[PDB]
Amino acid sequence: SRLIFEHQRRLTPPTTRKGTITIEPPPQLPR
């Protein structure tokens, strides 16, 4: 009946750099 299947290596899915980007604050209006 049912043919057989093997256990390969799963294709590496595209990565996801889970970085934590840090924005720099703005200026303060000298006046």
14 binds another protein (CB under 8 A): no
26 binds another protein (CB under 8 A): yes
Which amino acid makes up residue 6?
E
Radius of gyration of the chain, Cα coordinates, nearest whole angstrom: 26
25 binds another protein (CB under 8 A): yes
In the complex, least distance from residue 13 CB atom to another protein, rounded to whole angstroms: 19
27 binds another protein (CB under 8 A): yes
Structure tokens at 10: 């799963």
To the nearest 10°, the Cα dihedral for 21, 22, 23, 29?
Answer: 170
**List of residues contacting another protein (CB under 8 A):** 24-30
